[PDB]
Amino acid sequence: MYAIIETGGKQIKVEAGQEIYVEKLAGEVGDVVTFDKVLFVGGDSAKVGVPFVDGATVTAKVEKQGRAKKLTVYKYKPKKNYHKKQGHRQPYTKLTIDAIN
Protein backbone atom coordinates (compact mmCIF):
# COMPACT_ATOMS: atom_id res chain seq x y z
CA MET A 1 0.00 0.00 0.00
CA TYR A 2 1.46 3.31 -1.18
CA ALA A 3 0.21 6.85 -1.71
CA ILE A 4 1.16 9.86 -3.82
CA ILE A 5 1.34 13.14 -1.91
CA GLU A 6 2.10 16.70 -3.02
CA THR A 7 4.60 18.64 -0.92
CA GLY A 8 7.28 21.22 -1.65
CA GLY A 9 5.77 22.16 -5.00
CA LYS A 10 6.25 18.63 -6.36
CA GLN A 11 4.96 15.10 -5.80
CA ILE A 12 6.59 12.14 -4.05
CA LYS A 13 5.57 8.48 -3.90
CA VAL A 14 5.33 7.47 -0.25
CA GLU A 15 5.32 4.18 1.65
CA ALA A 16 5.05 3.23 5.32
CA GLY A 17 8.36 3.16 7.18
CA GLN A 18 10.26 5.06 4.47
CA GLU A 19 12.70 7.94 4.96
CA ILE A 20 12.33 10.85 2.52
CA TYR A 21 13.82 14.29 1.91
CA VAL A 22 11.59 17.29 1.16
CA GLU A 23 11.87 21.07 1.11
CA LYS A 24 12.16 22.85 4.44
CA LEU A 25 9.05 22.50 6.62
CA ALA A 26 7.99 23.92 9.98
CA GLY A 27 8.63 21.72 13.00
CA GLU A 28 11.28 20.70 15.51
CA VAL A 29 12.89 17.27 15.60
CA GLY A 30 10.41 14.70 16.89
CA ASP A 31 7.26 16.54 15.83
CA VAL A 32 4.61 14.84 13.70
CA VAL A 33 3.70 16.27 10.29
CA THR A 34 0.48 15.39 8.46
CA PHE A 35 -0.06 15.73 4.71
CA ASP A 36 -3.59 16.49 3.50
CA LYS A 37 -2.96 16.60 -0.28
CA VAL A 38 -3.10 12.95 -1.36
CA LEU A 39 -3.53 12.31 -5.08
CA PHE A 40 -3.54 8.51 -5.42
CA VAL A 41 -3.76 5.60 -2.97
CA GLY A 42 -2.75 2.14 -4.18
CA GLY A 43 -2.40 -1.39 -2.88
CA ASP A 44 -5.10 -4.08 -3.02
CA SER A 45 -7.40 -1.32 -4.32
CA ALA A 46 -7.29 2.02 -6.13
CA LYS A 47 -8.42 5.48 -5.01
CA VAL A 48 -7.99 8.07 -7.78
CA GLY A 49 -8.53 11.64 -6.65
CA VAL A 50 -10.00 14.50 -8.64
CA PRO A 51 -7.48 15.86 -7.90
CA PHE A 52 -7.26 14.88 -4.22
CA VAL A 53 -8.56 11.76 -2.50
CA ASP A 54 -11.19 12.88 0.00
CA GLY A 55 -10.35 12.25 3.65
CA ALA A 56 -6.92 10.69 3.04
CA THR A 57 -3.90 11.82 5.07
CA VAL A 58 -0.30 10.72 5.58
CA THR A 59 1.57 11.22 8.86
CA ALA A 60 5.33 11.43 9.36
CA LYS A 61 7.89 12.35 12.02
CA VAL A 62 10.65 14.93 11.63
CA GLU A 63 14.08 13.31 11.93
CA LYS A 64 16.57 16.01 10.91
CA GLN A 65 16.68 19.66 9.86
CA GLY A 66 19.73 20.53 7.80
CA ARG A 67 21.35 21.80 4.62
CA ALA A 68 22.59 19.77 1.67
CA LYS A 69 26.19 19.41 0.50
CA LYS A 70 27.90 22.61 -0.62
CA LEU A 71 27.71 23.73 -4.25
CA THR A 72 29.74 26.37 -6.06
CA VAL A 73 27.97 28.34 -8.80
CA TYR A 74 30.45 29.94 -11.19
CA LYS A 75 29.88 31.94 -14.38
CA TYR A 76 32.27 33.69 -16.76
CA LYS A 77 32.25 35.20 -20.24
CA PRO A 78 35.39 34.85 -22.40
CA LYS A 79 37.26 38.02 -23.43
CA LYS A 80 34.92 40.31 -21.45
CA ASN A 81 36.68 40.14 -18.04
CA TYR A 82 33.49 38.95 -16.31
CA HIS A 83 33.51 36.30 -13.58
CA LYS A 84 31.14 35.57 -10.71
CA LYS A 85 31.50 33.01 -7.89
CA GLN A 86 28.89 31.99 -5.33
CA GLY A 87 28.26 29.10 -2.96
CA HIS A 88 24.96 27.39 -2.19
CA ARG A 89 23.60 24.98 0.43
CA GLN A 90 19.95 24.00 -0.01
CA PRO A 91 18.04 23.41 3.26
CA TYR A 92 15.90 20.29 3.53
CA THR A 93 13.86 18.24 6.00
CA LYS A 94 14.22 14.51 6.66
CA LEU A 95 11.08 12.55 7.55
CA THR A 96 10.07 9.01 8.46
CA ILE A 97 6.67 7.88 7.23
CA ASP A 98 4.36 6.46 9.90
CA ALA A 99 0.98 5.48 8.42
CA ILE A 100 -1.28 5.99 5.41
CA ASN A 101 -4.96 6.78 5.96
Task: Report the interface residues with other proteins, using CB under 8 A.
Answer: 4, 10-11, 13, 39-40, 42, 46, 48-51, 72-76, 81-83
* 78 interacts with RNA by CB under 7 A: yes
User: Which entry of RNA, other proteins, none binds 69, CB below 5 to 8 A by partner kind?
Assistant: RNA
User: Is the CB of 32 or the CB of 68 nearer to RNA?
Assistant: 68
Residue 57: HSE in the Cβ half-sphere, 13 Å Cα cutoff: 8
- What CA–CA distances, in Å, run from 96 to 13, 42, 62? 13, 19, 7
Length of the chain: 101
User: Is the CB of 47 or the CB of 94 nearer to RNA?
Assistant: 94
Q: Which of 42, 45, 50 is nearest to 100 (CA)?
A: 42
Please identify, among the stretches 26-34, 35-43, 52-60, 64-72, the one whose residues bind RNA according to the rule CB under 7 A.
Answer: 64-72
User: Is the CB of 26 or the CB of 50 nearer to other proteins?
Assistant: 50
